[PDB]
Design a protein around this ligand. Structure first.
Ligand SMILES: O=C(CO)[C@@H](O)[C@@H](O)[C@H](O)COP(=O)(O)O
Ligand SMILES: O=C(CO)[C@@H](O)[C@@H](O)[C@H](O)COP(=O)(O)O
Ligand SMILES: O=C(CO)[C@@H](O)[C@@H](O)[C@H](O)COP(=O)(O)O
Ligand SMILES: O=C(CO)[C@@H](O)[C@@H](O)[C@H](O)COP(=O)(O)O
Lengths: 142, 172, 172, 142, 142, 172, 172, 142
């Protein structure tokens, strides 16, 4: 499986840690920010662009609070980004929302918890079915 | 001040608790979210709350669903809105103070009511503190999406999907 | 068919249960009653439901409060409405079959949900059957009250009382 | 205490029994239907008129289902009639609604239960206070 | 279908009314108290005896409050009697409890309501299935 | 005074409301009925409450299920018990004053909580008023069933049925 | 497997949801915590659950209160118990795998039910894996407290405080 | 105000940051672990001893998950330690439990969130009153 990742100056450290983690676990990673992005708008949009223009369906955005990356990337038509701070949303947003990416705030979530969140997200597939009506509604929006 | 609130069927009970609290606090509430617990769709209510805020009918908005992701994302996908998905007090205050977020999203099935109350109060108590730095971030955010006149203030925007739902197009 | 429903804060949970049931049964619901459980006033919602029915926005109405007396009485005090206060199936069927009642009132805190469901279902399943006897009763009922244009379709009818409430005039 | 009573053909029998009950319990009773009224509209309106013009603040209407007497009398401006078939509403409608009258359906409520309902209604005074706003609202309607 | 009925002095009047009703509606009625029973213990036990010793599965006991007939008849091993005052229990007790008889209190329930209750009871069959465990438990008791 | 209370899964919420009320009123409560809302069987709890009263561990008992019929009947089928199934205040007072009923049964899904509270309070406030007439009735009632030592105070009395249930013998 | 569960009045509803889930999963449940929502004291139920686990009546325990701090701390203060306060899945798994925690504490008013379910499931699914490192940590923890025979298996341990409460000593 | 702090190897980095934070905000800090403790049992017990013997009524323990420091320190008679990972418990445990210390897991909670949790804890006083019964009960346990 493939994973797209990116980060601004605040999330860079954790991004590097997760990158090594994912690579050591047979994951193919596409790092769109080898050097920290100017800010979370640039990093989140970079991850979004690479995702919507690739065959990967999972991505992780890193910044200080998570909120910013999701707020910005969700403005892009067709994008769905979930700020994740706990282990239930980690899988539920993938199952129900088919979240194309999750955003982790390094000033909010500790590293060990981040790894559990990430693994749950990566191990969960979109259920489709009745949930598609909601994804169709979102994609219709700006 | 006027607060618009919305939700899907999974968290109607949590929405009621927050609505009650807001009124006790002296806020005027415009409840848009679903009113019962019959299966419905979060984008509907996220859009209604978003437009109340964007059009000036409400000062700020609060939206909730199971995880909050769906409805807050729907709210974010509207002109004039900066929706902050916050299951914690810390990021909610940051969202208001730095990003001047005007819609707060919370996961009513993952956050306990006492903490939801704390997040809401902290978000509402916080004040946007403009700086050349965050103004640049906000302006960038406000210019990412391309305005669509067909969505803006169009109550029939989702009629197509709702019909397909009534016709069993979205079965499991 | 369209059903308008309303309630005060004491029975919002029971209203939600009935709303859910009505939708599962295929009815379109217009929820007017209060949406949370913050202290409010039954006449407000009884009047809202009554006008939905009287103006043709809804086919029938269902109103509930602790005992049902307050909200059903408020509903009855409107042009074109025949509100029947029924905490039992027997009188609810009589209300529809003989008096062609178009608004059903129930006490959500005195009747258990399973029986509320039975009352609602019986009321809706029943059909008005005109007879020389009930035709004359209905005509009399329809002509007791003197129409007040200032009340008809005026959502601000209780604003004076609401202001007095906000100013603490109605303290205990 | 004063009490106004009235009934149509279906509620007459119980009305007569209650009258005896009230007299035996030192109540000054005003019977507006010594003979059964033509229908519940006539009986309920007669009770309402007598009440809204008397010093009494308690009244009991009798018919087959209760629903009719309440539906009709409530159309009168200022009138508040409660159909009662159980013991909680019997007192709560007086406490909160200051119900000017209660309506008992003889085909619905048995005599022993009707007596308990009636005594609870007569024994309860309107609480006023915050409840007055709702009564002011009702009084304002047609 | 067959129906077993009985009553003490207080429920006799309604019993006679219901008897005529049932007969006028193609129902075969077995009246075990042509004359009012000494009390509700005698009437309820008479109905119970005739029921458990017959091929009928429905019965109606009449007394002043209903409670007495059920309290007494339920002491008999294998008997299940439901006091009924409203229209939901009327059918639910038959569906879930397979109530062998219902008890109506004439001082509690009006005649018109009694007929609706009775009809719902008579028109409902025992669902069996998972509910049988509860009926097995009851029959095991004294 | 000590009140034993029990219920099946359909009315656990109503039982909680009554338990709370009894404690506020100064009563000591022994909760036997089921504690959650997982599907279970009313006879189990009816028997536990009955034995608390019959053995002197509690002064009176209150049992509830959907309609109250099942659990009150189970309570009645025990030595030393006179269970009164009462969905109304009137018959509940009669049950206590004339039949000295020591177990009150109520349908938690058919009676609203405000009325349940009224029934309980009226039943508890009432006092048995012995007369040669009701003493004869009570004695007759107390002598209808034949005592079974295998049921009396036997906690494993229903083990047979419970096993069959765990083995899917009672499927639909 | 047998799971003992307890709670104070603030989270009885959440306890019920977890009890239901545990039974659906095939676990046998011993509900000790409070059964209604009448104001009570978390140490009472934390101690009850702790002893069920310590005495072998239950394999593991789960305790909840508003924040979980009070009841989990009470549970921890018992011989043979290692109570872990975990409002998240990550630390709950750590608690079981590394500290062989036998009592799980959760804040029912700060964690949403869906996440509570995930924490419980993760905790139960986890398995203790002994290592020289955690074996030494566990041994230290097991030897910090000094055993008090007067507390062990004494259900009357808090009677003095309960009497003071009944006498109004603990007023606000 | 006085505050006692301690940490093991995993919580040391955050502990150092918080110490700087507290000093900058006019707090008299007592650091019982200038060097990382061997493990969280040693650090949590050191904090407890210093606390129960000092005039300070606030303390912060640091480790990887928080769970351990609380589990260990709570075994001490009279001690009350709250693992905190969100902002409501941060103040409620002080208000109701009069928590003598809070435990933060560095692998669970990010720094920015930890600071908000810490400030809310330090800013809240124990309410006493009715809550004292629960504290008396805890104090009584081993
Ligand atoms: O978190 C969310 C959306 O972000 C949930 O509220 C939402 O996915 C609902 O679960 C949808 O409802 P249902 O179709 O009955 O499962
Ligand atoms: O039955 C009724 C009205 O018929 C009750 O719903 C109503 O009187 C409410 O109790 C009023 O609310 P509150 O002022 O908080 O007590
Ligand atoms: O009234 C009663 C019993 O008199 C009901 O409480 C009882 O029949 C329950 O409905 C049984 O539960 P379930 O098997 O899940 O339907
Ligand atoms: O989190 C906790 C305890 O850690 C709360 O459950 C507890 O402090 C309760 O609030 C006490 O109850 P009350 O006296 O009615 O406020």
């Amino acid at each position: 499986m493939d994973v797209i990742i990116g980060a601004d100056k605040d999330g860079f450290a954790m991004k590097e840690q997760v990158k090594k983690y994912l690579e050591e676990h047979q994951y193919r990673v596409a790092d769109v920010t080898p050097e920290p992005a100017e800010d979370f708008v640039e990093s989140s949009l970079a991850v979004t662009k690479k995702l919507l223009n690739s065959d990967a369906h999972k991505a992780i955005m890193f910044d200080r609070y998570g909120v910013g990356s999701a707020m910005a990337s969700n403005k892009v038509k067709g994008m769905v980004t979930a700020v994740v701070e706990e282990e239930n949303t980690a899988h539920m947003t993938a199952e129900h929302n088919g979240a194309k990416a999750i955003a982790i705030g390094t000033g909010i979530t500790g590293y060990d918890r981040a790894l559990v969140i990430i693994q749950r997200y990566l191990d969960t597939e979109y259920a489709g079915g009745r949930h598609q009506i909601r994804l169709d509604m979102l994609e219709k929006m700006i | 001040m006027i607060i618009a609130i919305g939700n899907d069927h999974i968290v109607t009970m949590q929405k009621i608790e927050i609505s009650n609290m807001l009124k006790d606090m002296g806020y005027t509430v415009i409840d848009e979210g679903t009113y019962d617990t019959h299966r419905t769709h979060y984008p509907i209510y996220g859009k209604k709350v978003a437009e109340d805020v964007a059009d000036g009918r409400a000062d700020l908005g609060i939206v909730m669903c199971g995880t909050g992701i769906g409805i807050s994302t729907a709210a974010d996908k509207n002109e004039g809105i900066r929706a902050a998905m916050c299951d914690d007090v810390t990021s909610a205050v940051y969202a208001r103070e730095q990003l001047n977020a005007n819609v707060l999203g919370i996961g009513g099935a993952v956050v306990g009511v006492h903490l939801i109350q704390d997040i809401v109060k902290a978000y509402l108590d916080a004040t946007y503190k403009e700086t050349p730095e965050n103004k640049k971030l906000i302006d960038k955010i406000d210019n990412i999406a391309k305005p669509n006149p067909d969505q803006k203030d169009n109550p029939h925007f989702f009629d197509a999907e709702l019909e397909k739902w009534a016709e069993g197009v979205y079965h499991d």
